[PDB]
Each structure stands twice: as structure tokens, then as C-alpha cells.
A = this chain, B = another copy of it.
Amino acid sequence: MRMSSGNIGVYKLDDSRVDYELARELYQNKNANYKLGSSFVRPIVNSTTGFMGVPHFQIEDEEAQYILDEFVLDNTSKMLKTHTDSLKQGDCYIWITREERENPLYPDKKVRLIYNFISPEEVKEIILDPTTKEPIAYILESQNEWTDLGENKRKAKVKQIITAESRFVEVEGDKIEGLEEGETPNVWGFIPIIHFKNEADETLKYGQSDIEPIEPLLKAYHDVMLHALKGSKMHSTPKLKLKLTDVASFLAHNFGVEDPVKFAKEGGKINLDGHEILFLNKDEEAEFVEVKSAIGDAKELLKLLFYCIVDVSETPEFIFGVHTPSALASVKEQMPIMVNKIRRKREQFTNSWQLLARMVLIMSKYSSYDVTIGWDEVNPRDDKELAETLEKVCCALDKALEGGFISEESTVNFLAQYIDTMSNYISDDPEREGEREKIIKTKML
């Protein structure tokens, strides 16, 4: 809508959070007020997070790339889980810690970068630089209830403030050996936490869940379905009427209900085999009192709300093909819609992944610290087509030799693209196979 320019309030950065426990309940169909409605939450988030792969960290520096692919081999599953958490809760917080602890289970890995999650409820607040809006400190708070290695219970409410300069930790309860109370210095002058903000907005401090736009539609869908189910249970099965001359005599003779008022008050239930025959007097009657449709129109409302839901999430329509079996004829035809949605969604997190790559590189000199990110194929390109392009270009090359020597550069670039597209396996997340094949080839030589 339009309005006069001089009748607008002052900007303020909203800090309202997503109801994280409610979001996890809806993702698990646990909330009592969305049990029927929240069915659609799982397929939307799962399809969106599964189609978008994990970042393929690329950098020209050899050692930086080796560190990056080691880290990817360590934490690809956790990166995918980070995508899923950002999609579901709207904001997932990631913390990297350097561990020098020596245990027998890792004889060779003396130094390990632990990819640690932080639940969004743990972070009570984040302190931002007002001019840059960069987070300068994190307010973490958690009640660690745990049992001693014997049979003794331990409760410990730990709060800790992490800053770029130092980390401050205190505990209110039973002692925990792992945590050393008070300030401890930060080995680097940056905060080791990375904020993954889903659907980030310049007017919102935090992210926001993909369940939020669909949530009222889920509520309406749940209400319609529950009312429909109650109406069906009440009235779907037909109700037999008998216009008996004397109800009490009939009840006493047939069903042995000597005292019908007590039978009703007690809640007694007549038993019938189903095979019945009615011998009635001239005046009595027997009919079925039944409904054309107990539901009425609720299926049409549910279809409308389903269309609204799949529109709101802009989920491509083969995901919900049970409602519309026509969509199953060609998923490949609808693949561009998925590709578009994944294009839009990946850019939200690619900056955070760049920051994480830069941080892990810093925490382990290098000529560069800016990491470009590749991605998995949403709909794969045929290797046969790529090889056809390669052969066709190469045969096109070696003719009209006045072009220059850049033909070799372009050819090796296309060869690198082909090798990258062939090494990575499409139905396996990430590019663990590329690094593994490279390492095995290096060993065999």
C-alpha cells in the first residue's frame, strides 16, 4: 500500500526470535495443535536442504585447499545438518574449537578442529557493534544436567561470554572438570562462532524459519482436518431409527434392557451381529438416518490450503505429487524450478560458508584467504554430453591456427571442469570422493 512520506515511524532493528522448540515440534509433528496440519513441514524442509548440497570450498593455494578438503572430509555431514537447522529453526549457531587433546582413538590427528553446534536457545543474546552490526560478543547460557560416572546426579547452570579478545565462563552448580571458570584468553582476535542466518533480513537481528510463512496455513489445515474427522466420526456411519409403538417394551423384549434410563446413564451399548431382520407391527417403522456427506466441503478447502501452502514455500510440485499425480509424469521437466529455488537459497548461506572457510584457514602464511564456493549439481549434466562437447571443441581446435595459444588454456580449463564433474558422484553429498580419489592416485602415483 501507499502512504505519505512524512507519516512513517522510525526504523528499529527487530530482535524477535523464532519459537525454536515449536519449530522443532512442527518438524517432528509433535505439537498437539498442528498434528494433522504439520505434515507438510517435513517434506518442504527436507527436499530443500537435500537438494542444496554442501559447499565445495575452492582456493588457488595448495595448502589452504588441502586443509579445506580435510575439514570437509571431517564435517560434511555436520555442514548438511547446519543447512537443515538453518532451514528449520531459522538460525543455527556454529562454533569451531581447536583441540590438542591426545587420545588413543586418534593416534595421528594431534590437532583437531572440532565442528561444534550451538543450539539457538543456548545463545541468550549476541552483542553487536552498532555502527557495523558485526557481532562482538555472544551470551551463551545452558543447564547441563548430567550424572557422575558413578550413580550420582549433577546439575550445573553454565553461562559463558565469548569475545574476540577472550572467553569468559562461569558455572552455578556442581563442578565440571572440563570447564575452567573465569576468563581465558582467546588465541586469535576474532570470535570463533559463526552465525548462519536463514532468510536474513536487514530489519531483523536474527534469521527466520521457513515454517513461519506456512504456519497459519498449517493451523487452518489442521483445524479443517480435525473438524472433518470429528464430523465423520460423529455422523459418517448411519444411524438407524425405529418409530416403535412402545420403545420400552421393545428394548426389554429384544435387548434385555429392563431399565433404559439406567442403561443410557450407565453408558451401556447394544450388541448387534450385523445380520438382523425386523418384524414390526403395522404402525411402526424403520429407516436409516444418514448423511449425503458428513465432510460437506472440507476436501475443497483442504485442496485450496494445500495449493496455498505449496505456493508459499514455492516447493516444486513433484514433491507433493500424491495430491497431483499428473506431476509425476516428468520431474525432469520441473527440475528448472528446483534449480531456481536452490540458486536463490544457496546464496543466503554462501557468505557464511566463505567466512567459515576463512576462519578455519586462519586457525591452521597462506598467500590467499578468500575462498570461492562450488556446489553440487541439482540436476546433473550427462557425462556423455560433456565428453561430446570436449571432443567437438578439440576437433574444432587444431584448425584455423591463427587464433592463438589460448586454445590450450581453454582446453585444459574445460578438462578440469570435466574432471571435477566426473570425479564427484551425483547421488553422494559433497565431494569426498574427489579428495579420496586424488589422495589414492597420489599414493599409487
Contacts and interface: CB of A to CB of B under 8 A. Distances in A.
A129 interface: yes
Interface residues of A, number: 277
Contacts of A340: 47, 50-51
A302 B304 contact: yes
A258 to B, nearest CB: 12
Contacts of A279: 242, 244, 247, 250-251
A293 B297 contact: yes
Given A13-B144, A130-B146, A289 B286 contact: yes
Contacts of A114: 132
Contact of A347 (B22, B40, B76): B76
Given A29-B312, A121-B9, A241-B278, A189 B334 contact: no
B240 A50 contact: no
Contact of A289 (B106, B288, B336): B288
A281 B243 contact: yes
Contacts of A8: 17, 20, 121, 124
A50 B344 contact: yes
B283 A85 contact: no
A364 interface: no
A276 interface: yes
A348 interface: yes
Nearest to A208: B28
Contact of A157 (B10, B229, B328): B10
Contacts of A283: 282
A404 B416 CA distance: 12
Nearest to A287: B289
Given A328-B330, A333-B331, A350-B77, A237 B244 contact: no
A176 B410 CA distance: 53
Q: Which 3 pairs across A and B sit closest by C-beta, in order of nearness?
A: A131-B178, A236-B296, A231-B237
Given A127-B148, A269-B275, A299-B304, 6 more contacts: A80-B344, A105-B189, A117-B202, A237-B294, A250-B279, A326-B326
